[PDB]
Amino acid sequence: GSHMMEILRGSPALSAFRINKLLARFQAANLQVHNIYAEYVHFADLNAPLNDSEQAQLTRLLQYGPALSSHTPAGKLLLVTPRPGTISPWSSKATDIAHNCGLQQVDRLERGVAYYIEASTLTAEQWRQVAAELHDRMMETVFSSLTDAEKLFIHHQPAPVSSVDLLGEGRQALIDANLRLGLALAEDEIDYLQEAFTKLGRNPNDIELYMFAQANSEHCRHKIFNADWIIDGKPQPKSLFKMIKNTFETTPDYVLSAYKDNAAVMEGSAVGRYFADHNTGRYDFHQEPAHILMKVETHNHPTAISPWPGAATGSGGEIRDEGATGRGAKPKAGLVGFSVSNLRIPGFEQPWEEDFGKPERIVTALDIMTEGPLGGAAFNNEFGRPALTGYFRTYEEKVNSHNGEELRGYHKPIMLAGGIGNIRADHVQKGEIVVGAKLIVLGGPAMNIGLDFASVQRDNPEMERRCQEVIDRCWQLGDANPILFIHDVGAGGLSNAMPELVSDGGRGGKFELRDILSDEPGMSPLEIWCNESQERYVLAVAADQLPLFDELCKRERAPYAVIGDATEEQHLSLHDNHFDNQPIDLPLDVLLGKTPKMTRDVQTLKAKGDALNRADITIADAVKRVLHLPTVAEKTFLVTIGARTVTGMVARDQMVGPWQVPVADCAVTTASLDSYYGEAMSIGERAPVALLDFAASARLAVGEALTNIAATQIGDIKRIKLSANWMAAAGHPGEDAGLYDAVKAVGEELCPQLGLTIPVGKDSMSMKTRWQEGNEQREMTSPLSLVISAFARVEDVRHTLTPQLSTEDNALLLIDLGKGHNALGATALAQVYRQLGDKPADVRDVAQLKGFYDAMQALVAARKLLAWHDRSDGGLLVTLAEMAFAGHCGVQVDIAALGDDHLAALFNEELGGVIQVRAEDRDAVEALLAQYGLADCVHYLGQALAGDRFVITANDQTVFSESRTTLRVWWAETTWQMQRLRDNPQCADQEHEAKANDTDPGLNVKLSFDINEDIAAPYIATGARPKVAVLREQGVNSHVEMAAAFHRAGFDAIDVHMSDLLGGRIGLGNFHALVACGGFSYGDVLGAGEGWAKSILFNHRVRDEFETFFHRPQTLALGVCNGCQMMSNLRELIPGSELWPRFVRNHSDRFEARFSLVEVTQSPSLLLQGMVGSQMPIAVSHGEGRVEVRDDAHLAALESKGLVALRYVDNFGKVTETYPANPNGSPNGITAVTTENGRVTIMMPHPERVFRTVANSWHPENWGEDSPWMRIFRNARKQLG
Ligand SMILES: Nc1ncnc2c1ncn2[C@@H]1O[C@H](COP(=O)(O)OP(=O)(O)O)[C@@H](O)[C@H]1O
Ligand SMILES: [Mg+2]
Ligand SMILES: [Mg+2]
Ligand SMILES: [Mg+2]
C-alpha cells in the first residue's frame, strides 16, 4: 500500500556451460533433474503510475545482456532474490539509471533469477537441496512466486531509541545490555559506564553504549600494540607501537606524514599534475610536486564469511583511506594479498593436502580464492585503480611448532588490500576546524550493514568513484580547496568517524539524525549512527563554501548531506527530529575516556623442529611438487581479472615480456603523464618461517620486499618506506612473545640499521578458528604473519629490470645472501613434503643486505643489467625456472660452488637472486659487487641459451634436466584449474594449451608507418588548438589519460560530464570532436554502456544534441571501451552505423585485462589513416567486449561493407577466436568498427592507456617516447585541419 509492484521479465540468465555445471552438480548429489532454465526477472516498486511511453522506456532499460536462447517456462519455479531487508548494489545502480532517464515514479528496481526446474521425482527434502544449490544463504533467499518479491519492498516505521535502566536495576542493566547488544565490554569498562552515567544522573541510551563499545574494542583502541609487556619475567621498556615508531625517530628522511592520518606520506617528484581547471573545464599540466601516500589494510574476518564483498570492501575502505588523506588526495594504484588454507581443487588434489575439516559457518579456502579475488578486482575495476602487485600463499598442515603438534593454517584468511596515491604539498596537513564548520557525510545512503549476517558486507564501487571525483575537484582547487578536514567512514560507522573528526580538530559537534541519508527508514538511531555501510566519508567545510561544495557534488552526482555543526564546547549532541528527543548527549572526554593500559605477562616458546626427512625426496619429484604449490605457481587467475592500465601511468605490471608471464617482482607507475619519475611497490612475506623462528620471519619479510624492489631506479635506500601489517593469534601459546620479538627485530634492529622507515601499519590479532569436528575440539592457528609492503619514489621508470632473460651473450650470477647456509626449514620444499624442517632462512648479514641494495642500484643506474629475479618461494630452482619462462628460453647452470647438498642449494629460500649481465660485462660487475663486500656470496652459474632446455649440472654430473615448456606448463596448472572451475572451461583450456606450444613467438610488431613522425606538429606549431569534448558519465574512469593523449596531439581537451550537457553548461555545437571515455558508468548495470546511452535517448533535448553533432559534415567522434559500448547503444543517432554490432559478456565469462595483439584493417576510419596492416599490442580491459551480431547475415553484411577497423590476431599473426589472443570471443577477431563516412570510430581496446612507450607492458627496445597508438590522436588533429 502507497506503492505498486510491477513484474518485468528479463533475458535468459545463464550460458550453456553454466547450465551444464548446474545439471552436473545435481547428478553428483543424486538429484535426478531432467532440465534447468533461468531467466532474469525485474521488480519495479512505483510511487506513481507510468504512461504507455514511460512503460516502454522502462521495458527498454530492462532489455540487456547476451542474446541467449529464450524458452517458455516449465516445471517448478524457484526465484532467487536478495534477502528481504537488503538492497543489492544492482538495485542502487539500476534505480539511478531509471531516475536519470526521467522515471521518477520508480522508487526502486530490484532483480532476481527465476529458475525453471524439471525433475518430477524429488521428495520435498530434495527440493530444499535443489534450492540450496541455486543460492547464497548469506545474501539471498528463495521464493515460490514472482509475487513474493513484494516482501523486498516493505516500508518500515523508524524504530525508537531504547534506554538501559541503570537507575532502576543497577549494574545488572549494563550486564544485560552487554549480552543483548553484544558489546563485548570488560568489567573495568562496565565500571566506567556505571560511574559516568551515575554521575550524569540519567540512564544511558543503547546507541551511547554501542558507540562506546565500538570505540573501546581491540581493533579500534589497539590495546595490544600499546600494551606494556613482561616477557620471561622481565618488564620491557617499549610497547610495540613505540618500537615501530623507533624507525621514524631513526629515519625521518623524506617523510611528510606518519602516524597522524589514515595513510602515510612521503616526498614524490616535481611533475605535470594533469586535470581540468575549475573555471575553463580545460585539462592542463600543473608543474608542482606530486607527493606519495601509502596504506595497507586487511579485512580478514568478513572474507571468511562472505569472501566477495569481504575482499571488495577490503579494497573499498582502503581506497577511502587514501582519498581522505590530508585535505583530499587521489588514489593511483593498488596491491592485493591472500593467505588461505589448502585449495584441494576437485580432481587436482596435491600430495601434501589433507582435509582437516572446518567450521560450518565459514567458507573453504577454495571459495575464498574463487570469489575473493573477483570481489577485490570488482572494486578496483569499477572504482578505477590498477592492481599491480600482490601475493597469494597457501598453508595448512599439522606441524610440530612452538606449542607442540597442532594444525596451523589460514581458515580465517588474510585478505590484504593497499596502495599508493598522490597528494599536493599544501594538502598533506589536515587543517583546523573552525567553530560553526559544517559537518558533512559524503557518499551512499546508509543501510543496516555490520550491525552471521552482520559480517556480510556490500560494495558499490561506482558510488565511491563519484565521491573521489568530488574529492578531486576539491584538491584541484589548490588554495581554494574547501575541504577543511576529511576522514573515511569504516568500523563503528559514523559513531566513530564524526567524533574522531571533531575531536582531531579540538571541537565538539551537534548533529541531526534525520539529516543523514538512508535507504532503510526502519533503522533505529543506533543502527543509523553505528552501521558500517560503505562508500562514505566525513568532512568539514566552512558554511560559506557550502554552495561551491553543492555545485561540485551535483555535477558528479555524488550524494552528500550536511548533518551537523562543529561546536567550541567539546560536547557530542545527536538530535532526532522525528521523535523530538536526543539519542546522544555526552561530553567527549566521557565517550573517549579510557581505561588503563593492558599488561601482557608472557613466556617464550621455541620449537625444536626436526631435520628434513628426505626418504621420498628426489630433486626431480621436488621440482614437480614445488611448481604445484599455489604459493609458487603461476598467478594469472589473480592478475588478468583486474585492470592494469587504468591511469595511463603504469610502467611495470605483473605480466612480463612477449609471452606475458606474470613474474614481475615489483610494480612501477610514472608520477605523471609527462615524466619518467615514478613510484614503486613491492611486498615481502614469509609467515611459515614463524613456525620455527619469529624474528627471522619478520626479518625475511623486510628483506624480500627489498629484493623484489631492487632492480628499480631509486637511489638512497632511505627513499624506501614500509607498511608493516601484523597478523597473529594473540594469546595462543608462544605467539605473544613471538610478536614482541619480531616487532623488536624489525623496529629496534633491522630497519634502523638499514635506514628504513615504517611510517604506517595495521594489526589483526585473532588469527585462529575453533570448531567441533567429531566429539573433538579442533583449532586452526595462523603462524605470526608479517606482511611488509615497500614504497619508493623512482628516479627513472625506464630503467626497471624484469626477470625476462636475453639470449644475447650473457652471464648468470647468483647473489647468495644466505652465505651458503642453504636452510631448508619452512621452505616450499618442506611444505610440499608435509614437513617443517629444522632451521629456516634469515637475514645473515645486515651490511651485506644494504650492500646488495646499493650495488643493485649502481648496476641499474649504470645499465649493467639485462635481467633480475629474486629468490623467494621455491628457491633458486624457481627463480631460474621463472626467468626461463619469461625469456622463453633455456638455461645451462652449474651449482658445484653452492655446496655438496644440491637439494639445499636449489631449494633454500635465503635472500638474494640471479642477475643476468652481458658476457663482456661479467668481470666489471663481479668487481663492483666485490666493492660492496659481496665477493663471497656471488657465484657465476652459467648462461641463458636459445631453446627449450633447462639444465642444472654439478661438475660432470647432471643434477636436473627437463624441457622448459614442460616445467612452464606444470607451473601453469594451478591457474589453469582455477580458471577451469571459475570461468568458461573452454577458454581456460585454450589459454593453458597455448603455453605448451614452444613455437609461440610471443607479442611482436609490424608497423605500416613511422611511429616517430609527428604528423600533427605543423598544426601544433600554428598555436591553433581545436577543442575536443572528453565526454564522461558517472563511473567513467579513463578521462584524464584520454585528455592527455588528445593534448599531445594538439587539442584543448575540455572535461564534459553528462551533467554539464543536461544542465546546459556545454553545447556540442561548439566542438568539432568528441570522445566517449572508458569506465564502468553505472557499474555496467542494465548492460555496459546502456544506462549512459539510454539517458541520452530518453532526454529529447540531449538526444537531439548528439544526433545534430553526428549529422554534421565534418565532426569526428571516438568511443573507447565503455564509450564504444555507449555509442553502439546510441546507434540510431549516428549515420552509417546500421550494421554495427552489440558488445556483450565475454565468452570466458570473466573480466579480461590483457596486453593483446591486434592488427589494423582496411576501413573508412579517419582515425586509423596510415596504420593499415600495422600489428601491435594494445591495452584491453573489459568484461563485456564480445561482438554480438543478430545472425550470420548481419556479420557478412558488416564484413562486406568494409567497416571492421581492428582485429585480434594470435602471435603467429593470424585473425583468431582462440583465447586469450582474442580475449572476448568476438567473431573474426572484431574489436573496432567505423561508419560508412569514417568519421565515427568505436573500439573496445584502450589506445589512450598506451600512447606512451613507457606505459606498454612489453615493447620493442628501439621505440621512443611515442607508441604506435599515438597516431590516432594525431590523425584526429590533422583531419580537423
Ligand atoms: N593476490 C594477487 N593479486 C594480484 N597479483 C598477484 C597476487 N599474488 C601474486 N601476484 C603477482 O604475481 C606475480 C608473482 O607473484 P609471487 O611469485 O608471489 O611474487 P614473488 O615470489 O616475486 O614475491 C607478481 O608479479 C605478483 O605481484
Ligand atoms: Mg614467487
Ligand atoms: Mg620476487
Ligand atoms: Mg613474495
PDB file of N, CA, C and O in Angstrom, residues 219-270:
ATOM      1  N   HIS A 219      40.520  -3.970  17.891  1.00  0.00           N
ATOM      2  CA  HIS A 219      40.825  -3.472  16.521  1.00  0.00           C
ATOM      3  C   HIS A 219      40.901  -1.940  16.446  1.00  0.00           C
ATOM      4  O   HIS A 219      41.650  -1.438  15.602  1.00  0.00           O
ATOM      5  N   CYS A 220      40.172  -1.230  17.341  1.00  0.00           N
ATOM      6  CA  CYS A 220      39.993   0.245  17.319  1.00  0.00           C
ATOM      7  C   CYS A 220      40.831   1.036  18.353  1.00  0.00           C
ATOM      8  O   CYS A 220      41.399   2.058  18.012  1.00  0.00           O
ATOM      9  N   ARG A 221      40.938   0.585  19.601  1.00  0.00           N
ATOM     10  CA  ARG A 221      41.908   1.195  20.553  1.00  0.00           C
ATOM     11  C   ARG A 221      43.366   0.707  20.375  1.00  0.00           C
ATOM     12  O   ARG A 221      44.293   1.352  20.908  1.00  0.00           O
ATOM     13  N   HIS A 222      43.566  -0.431  19.685  1.00  0.00           N
ATOM     14  CA  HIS A 222      44.888  -1.089  19.528  1.00  0.00           C
ATOM     15  C   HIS A 222      45.537  -1.381  20.892  1.00  0.00           C
ATOM     16  O   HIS A 222      46.665  -0.959  21.185  1.00  0.00           O
ATOM     17  N   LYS A 223      44.788  -2.071  21.741  1.00  0.00           N
ATOM     18  CA  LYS A 223      45.202  -2.269  23.117  1.00  0.00           C
ATOM     19  C   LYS A 223      46.500  -3.060  23.161  1.00  0.00           C
ATOM     20  O   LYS A 223      47.407  -2.700  23.912  1.00  0.00           O
ATOM     21  N   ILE A 224      46.593  -4.103  22.330  1.00  0.00           N
ATOM     22  CA  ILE A 224      47.784  -4.961  22.300  1.00  0.00           C
ATOM     23  C   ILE A 224      49.040  -4.171  21.876  1.00  0.00           C
ATOM     24  O   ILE A 224      50.082  -4.266  22.526  1.00  0.00           O
ATOM     25  N   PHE A 225      48.915  -3.388  20.813  1.00  0.00           N
ATOM     26  CA  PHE A 225      50.045  -2.583  20.326  1.00  0.00           C
ATOM     27  C   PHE A 225      50.499  -1.442  21.239  1.00  0.00           C
ATOM     28  O   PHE A 225      51.648  -1.022  21.151  1.00  0.00           O
ATOM     29  N   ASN A 226      49.649  -0.989  22.150  1.00  0.00           N
ATOM     30  CA  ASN A 226      50.094  -0.047  23.177  1.00  0.00           C
ATOM     31  C   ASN A 226      50.437  -0.653  24.538  1.00  0.00           C
ATOM     32  O   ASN A 226      50.998   0.054  25.406  1.00  0.00           O
ATOM     33  N   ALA A 227      50.158  -1.946  24.706  1.00  0.00           N
ATOM     34  CA  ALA A 227      50.427  -2.626  25.973  1.00  0.00           C
ATOM     35  C   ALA A 227      51.878  -2.527  26.447  1.00  0.00           C
ATOM     36  O   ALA A 227      52.808  -2.432  25.656  1.00  0.00           O
ATOM     37  N   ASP A 228      52.017  -2.547  27.768  1.00  0.00           N
ATOM     38  CA  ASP A 228      53.263  -2.822  28.467  1.00  0.00           C
ATOM     39  C   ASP A 228      53.415  -4.329  28.426  1.00  0.00           C
ATOM     40  O   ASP A 228      52.426  -5.065  28.395  1.00  0.00           O
ATOM     41  N   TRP A 229      54.653  -4.784  28.411  1.00  0.00           N
ATOM     42  CA  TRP A 229      54.976  -6.193  28.343  1.00  0.00           C
ATOM     43  C   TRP A 229      55.899  -6.657  29.445  1.00  0.00           C
ATOM     44  O   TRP A 229      56.771  -5.912  29.897  1.00  0.00           O
ATOM     45  N   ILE A 230      55.710  -7.921  29.831  1.00  0.00           N
ATOM     46  CA  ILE A 230      56.621  -8.665  30.677  1.00  0.00           C
ATOM     47  C   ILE A 230      56.853  -9.996  30.007  1.00  0.00           C
ATOM     48  O   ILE A 230      55.914 -10.713  29.701  1.00  0.00           O
ATOM     49  N   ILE A 231      58.118 -10.335  29.802  1.00  0.00           N
ATOM     50  CA  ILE A 231      58.483 -11.452  28.951  1.00  0.00           C
ATOM     51  C   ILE A 231      59.518 -12.267  29.687  1.00  0.00           C
ATOM     52  O   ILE A 231      60.615 -11.771  29.950  1.00  0.00           O
ATOM     53  N   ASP A 232      59.173 -13.521  30.006  1.00  0.00           N
ATOM     54  CA  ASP A 232      60.062 -14.402  30.751  1.00  0.00           C
ATOM     55  C   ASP A 232      60.498 -13.708  32.060  1.00  0.00           C
ATOM     56  O   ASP A 232      61.671 -13.739  32.436  1.00  0.00           O
ATOM     57  N   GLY A 233      59.544 -13.051  32.718  1.00  0.00           N
ATOM     58  CA  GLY A 233      59.790 -12.402  33.991  1.00  0.00           C
ATOM     59  C   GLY A 233      60.402 -11.009  33.970  1.00  0.00           C
ATOM     60  O   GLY A 233      60.562 -10.418  35.028  1.00  0.00           O
ATOM     61  N   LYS A 234      60.743 -10.468  32.797  1.00  0.00           N
ATOM     62  CA  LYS A 234      61.371  -9.146  32.735  1.00  0.00           C
ATOM     63  C   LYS A 234      60.446  -8.126  32.101  1.00  0.00           C
ATOM     64  O   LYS A 234      60.003  -8.304  30.939  1.00  0.00           O
ATOM     65  N   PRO A 235      60.161  -7.039  32.845  1.00  0.00           N
ATOM     66  CA  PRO A 235      59.456  -5.935  32.206  1.00  0.00           C
ATOM     67  C   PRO A 235      60.227  -5.373  31.011  1.00  0.00           C
ATOM     68  O   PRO A 235      61.447  -5.319  31.049  1.00  0.00           O
ATOM     69  N   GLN A 236      59.513  -5.008  29.952  1.00  0.00           N
ATOM     70  CA  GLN A 236      60.152  -4.481  28.767  1.00  0.00           C
ATOM     71  C   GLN A 236      59.957  -2.963  28.707  1.00  0.00           C
ATOM     72  O   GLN A 236      58.965  -2.419  29.164  1.00  0.00           O
ATOM     73  N   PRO A 237      60.946  -2.270  28.158  1.00  0.00           N
ATOM     74  CA  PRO A 237      60.881  -0.798  28.134  1.00  0.00           C
ATOM     75  C   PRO A 237      59.865  -0.184  27.109  1.00  0.00           C
ATOM     76  O   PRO A 237      59.464   0.972  27.266  1.00  0.00           O
ATOM     77  N   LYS A 238      59.488  -0.930  26.065  1.00  0.00           N
ATOM     78  CA  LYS A 238      58.758  -0.334  24.940  1.00  0.00           C
ATOM     79  C   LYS A 238      57.565  -1.175  24.540  1.00  0.00           C
ATOM     80  O   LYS A 238      57.632  -2.410  24.511  1.00  0.00           O
ATOM     81  N   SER A 239      56.479  -0.490  24.228  1.00  0.00           N
ATOM     82  CA  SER A 239      55.360  -1.091  23.552  1.00  0.00           C
ATOM     83  C   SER A 239      55.736  -1.381  22.095  1.00  0.00           C
ATOM     84  O   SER A 239      56.765  -0.953  21.619  1.00  0.00           O
ATOM     85  N   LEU A 240      54.879  -2.131  21.420  1.00  0.00           N
ATOM     86  CA  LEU A 240      55.065  -2.484  20.026  1.00  0.00           C
ATOM     87  C   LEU A 240      54.995  -1.237  19.157  1.00  0.00           C
ATOM     88  O   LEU A 240      55.840  -1.046  18.275  1.00  0.00           O
ATOM     89  N   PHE A 241      54.009  -0.400  19.401  1.00  0.00           N
ATOM     90  CA  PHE A 241      53.859   0.809  18.623  1.00  0.00           C
ATOM     91  C   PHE A 241      55.112   1.643  18.767  1.00  0.00           C
ATOM     92  O   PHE A 241      55.620   2.121  17.786  1.00  0.00           O
ATOM     93  N   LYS A 242      55.660   1.740  19.969  1.00  0.00           N
ATOM     94  CA  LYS A 242      56.882   2.534  20.200  1.00  0.00           C
ATOM     95  C   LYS A 242      58.093   2.021  19.421  1.00  0.00           C
ATOM     96  O   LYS A 242      58.922   2.818  18.918  1.00  0.00           O
ATOM     97  N   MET A 243      58.223   0.694  19.383  1.00  0.00           N
ATOM     98  CA  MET A 243      59.244   0.033  18.569  1.00  0.00           C
ATOM     99  C   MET A 243      59.063   0.250  17.045  1.00  0.00           C
ATOM    100  O   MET A 243      60.066   0.355  16.321  1.00  0.00           O
ATOM    101  N   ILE A 244      57.811   0.307  16.566  1.00  0.00           N
ATOM    102  CA  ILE A 244      57.552   0.710  15.180  1.00  0.00           C
ATOM    103  C   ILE A 244      57.960   2.190  15.029  1.00  0.00           C
ATOM    104  O   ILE A 244      58.683   2.509  14.072  1.00  0.00           O
ATOM    105  N   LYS A 245      57.523   3.074  15.943  1.00  0.00           N
ATOM    106  CA  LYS A 245      57.887   4.496  15.837  1.00  0.00           C
ATOM    107  C   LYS A 245      59.405   4.716  15.853  1.00  0.00           C
ATOM    108  O   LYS A 245      59.878   5.678  15.249  1.00  0.00           O
ATOM    109  N   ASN A 246      60.163   3.820  16.498  1.00  0.00           N
ATOM    110  CA  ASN A 246      61.618   3.908  16.529  1.00  0.00           C
ATOM    111  C   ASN A 246      62.236   4.078  15.135  1.00  0.00           C
ATOM    112  O   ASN A 246      63.300   4.699  14.984  1.00  0.00           O
ATOM    113  N   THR A 247      61.579   3.535  14.124  1.00  0.00           N
ATOM    114  CA  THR A 247      62.059   3.642  12.746  1.00  0.00           C
ATOM    115  C   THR A 247      61.967   5.044  12.115  1.00  0.00           C
ATOM    116  O   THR A 247      62.772   5.387  11.224  1.00  0.00           O
ATOM    117  N   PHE A 248      60.978   5.800  12.580  1.00  0.00           N
ATOM    118  CA  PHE A 248      60.763   7.202  12.224  1.00  0.00           C
ATOM    119  C   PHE A 248      61.672   8.152  13.028  1.00  0.00           C
ATOM    120  O   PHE A 248      62.179   9.143  12.501  1.00  0.00           O
ATOM    121  N   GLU A 249      61.915   7.831  14.290  1.00  0.00           N
ATOM    122  CA  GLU A 249      62.900   8.552  15.110  1.00  0.00           C
ATOM    123  C   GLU A 249      64.274   8.344  14.510  1.00  0.00           C
ATOM    124  O   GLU A 249      65.035   9.245  14.503  1.00  0.00           O
ATOM    125  N   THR A 250      64.577   7.162  13.970  1.00  0.00           N
ATOM    126  CA  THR A 250      65.884   6.919  13.430  1.00  0.00           C
ATOM    127  C   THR A 250      66.011   7.472  12.018  1.00  0.00           C
ATOM    128  O   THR A 250      67.022   8.042  11.716  1.00  0.00           O
ATOM    129  N   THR A 251      64.993   7.275  11.177  1.00  0.00           N
ATOM    130  CA  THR A 251      64.967   7.716   9.789  1.00  0.00           C
ATOM    131  C   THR A 251      63.672   8.475   9.489  1.00  0.00           C
ATOM    132  O   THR A 251      62.675   7.861   9.085  1.00  0.00           O
ATOM    133  N   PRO A 252      63.689   9.820   9.702  1.00  0.00           N
ATOM    134  CA  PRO A 252      62.573  10.691   9.302  1.00  0.00           C
ATOM    135  C   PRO A 252      62.702  11.134   7.878  1.00  0.00           C
ATOM    136  O   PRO A 252      61.837  11.839   7.397  1.00  0.00           O
ATOM    137  N   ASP A 253      63.791  10.759   7.231  1.00  0.00           N
ATOM    138  CA  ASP A 253      64.138  11.278   5.912  1.00  0.00           C
ATOM    139  C   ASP A 253      63.004  11.046   4.898  1.00  0.00           C
ATOM    140  O   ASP A 253      62.450   9.937   4.822  1.00  0.00           O
ATOM    141  N   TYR A 254      62.669  12.107   4.145  1.00  0.00           N
ATOM    142  CA  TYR A 254      61.666  12.074   3.071  1.00  0.00           C
ATOM    143  C   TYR A 254      60.225  11.910   3.557  1.00  0.00           C
ATOM    144  O   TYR A 254      59.316  11.895   2.723  1.00  0.00           O
ATOM    145  N   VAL A 255      60.014  11.781   4.870  1.00  0.00           N
ATOM    146  CA  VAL A 255      58.694  11.529   5.389  1.00  0.00           C
ATOM    147  C   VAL A 255      58.015  12.877   5.646  1.00  0.00           C
ATOM    148  O   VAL A 255      58.552  13.695   6.358  1.00  0.00           O
ATOM    149  N   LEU A 256      56.814  13.020   5.124  1.00  0.00           N
ATOM    150  CA  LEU A 256      55.963  14.170   5.234  1.00  0.00           C
ATOM    151  C   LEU A 256      54.854  13.984   6.272  1.00  0.00           C
ATOM    152  O   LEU A 256      54.449  14.907   6.897  1.00  0.00           O
ATOM    153  N   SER A 257      54.352  12.778   6.410  1.00  0.00           N
ATOM    154  CA  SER A 257      53.354  12.466   7.422  1.00  0.00           C
ATOM    155  C   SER A 257      53.357  11.008   7.833  1.00  0.00           C
ATOM    156  O   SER A 257      53.342  10.095   7.006  1.00  0.00           O
ATOM    157  N   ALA A 258      53.333  10.793   9.142  1.00  0.00           N
ATOM    158  CA  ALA A 258      53.423   9.446   9.713  1.00  0.00           C
ATOM    159  C   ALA A 258      52.677   9.393  11.029  1.00  0.00           C
ATOM    160  O   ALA A 258      52.875  10.266  11.895  1.00  0.00           O
ATOM    161  N   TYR A 259      51.833   8.366  11.178  1.00  0.00           N
ATOM    162  CA  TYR A 259      51.040   8.132  12.408  1.00  0.00           C
ATOM    163  C   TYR A 259      50.024   9.266  12.776  1.00  0.00           C
ATOM    164  O   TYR A 259      49.545   9.293  13.880  1.00  0.00           O
ATOM    165  N   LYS A 260      49.716  10.205  11.886  1.00  0.00           N
ATOM    166  CA  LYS A 260      48.790  11.304  12.216  1.00  0.00           C
ATOM    167  C   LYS A 260      47.564  11.365  11.278  1.00  0.00           C
ATOM    168  O   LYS A 260      46.805  12.359  11.276  1.00  0.00           O
ATOM    169  N   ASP A 261      47.355  10.278  10.540  1.00  0.00           N
ATOM    170  CA  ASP A 261      46.405  10.231   9.424  1.00  0.00           C
ATOM    171  C   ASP A 261      46.139   8.767   9.126  1.00  0.00           C
ATOM    172  O   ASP A 261      46.743   7.896   9.758  1.00  0.00           O
ATOM    173  N   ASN A 262      45.257   8.490   8.175  1.00  0.00           N
ATOM    174  CA  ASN A 262      44.967   7.103   7.838  1.00  0.00           C
ATOM    175  C   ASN A 262      45.711   6.647   6.571  1.00  0.00           C
ATOM    176  O   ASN A 262      45.411   5.607   6.050  1.00  0.00           O
ATOM    177  N   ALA A 263      46.693   7.416   6.104  1.00  0.00           N
ATOM    178  CA  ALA A 263      47.763   6.934   5.242  1.00  0.00           C
ATOM    179  C   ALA A 263      49.025   7.660   5.691  1.00  0.00           C
ATOM    180  O   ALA A 263      48.944   8.668   6.366  1.00  0.00           O
ATOM    181  N   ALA A 264      50.190   7.157   5.325  1.00  0.00           N
ATOM    182  CA  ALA A 264      51.449   7.908   5.454  1.00  0.00           C
ATOM    183  C   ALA A 264      51.755   8.616   4.121  1.00  0.00           C
ATOM    184  O   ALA A 264      51.198   8.278   3.069  1.00  0.00           O
ATOM    185  N   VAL A 265      52.629   9.608   4.183  1.00  0.00           N
ATOM    186  CA  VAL A 265      53.012  10.385   3.010  1.00  0.00           C
ATOM    187  C   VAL A 265      54.510  10.569   2.978  1.00  0.00           C
ATOM    188  O   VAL A 265      55.105  10.900   3.968  1.00  0.00           O
ATOM    189  N   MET A 266      55.088  10.411   1.809  1.00  0.00           N
ATOM    190  CA  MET A 266      56.491  10.715   1.573  1.00  0.00           C
ATOM    191  C   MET A 266      56.618  11.650   0.361  1.00  0.00           C
ATOM    192  O   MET A 266      55.678  11.805  -0.431  1.00  0.00           O
ATOM    193  N   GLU A 267      57.810  12.206   0.187  1.00  0.00           N
ATOM    194  CA  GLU A 267      58.128  13.082  -0.934  1.00  0.00           C
ATOM    195  C   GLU A 267      58.141  12.325  -2.256  1.00  0.00           C
ATOM    196  O   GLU A 267      58.730  11.239  -2.365  1.00  0.00           O
ATOM    197  N   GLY A 268      57.523  12.932  -3.267  1.00  0.00           N
ATOM    198  CA  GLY A 268      57.425  12.428  -4.630  1.00  0.00           C
ATOM    199  C   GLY A 268      58.380  13.259  -5.477  1.00  0.00           C
ATOM    200  O   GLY A 268      59.506  13.515  -5.070  1.00  0.00           O
ATOM    201  N   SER A 269      57.922  13.703  -6.640  1.00  0.00           N
ATOM    202  CA  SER A 269      58.770  14.400  -7.601  1.00  0.00           C
ATOM    203  C   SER A 269      57.994  15.550  -8.150  1.00  0.00           C
ATOM    204  O   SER A 269      56.746  15.529  -8.136  1.00  0.00           O
ATOM    205  N   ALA A 270      58.700  16.533  -8.684  1.00  0.00           N
ATOM    206  CA  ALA A 270      58.016  17.641  -9.339  1.00  0.00           C
ATOM    207  C   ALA A 270      57.702  17.297 -10.796  1.00  0.00           C
ATOM    208  O   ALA A 270      58.625  17.054 -11.596  1.00  0.00           O
TER     209      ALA A 270
END
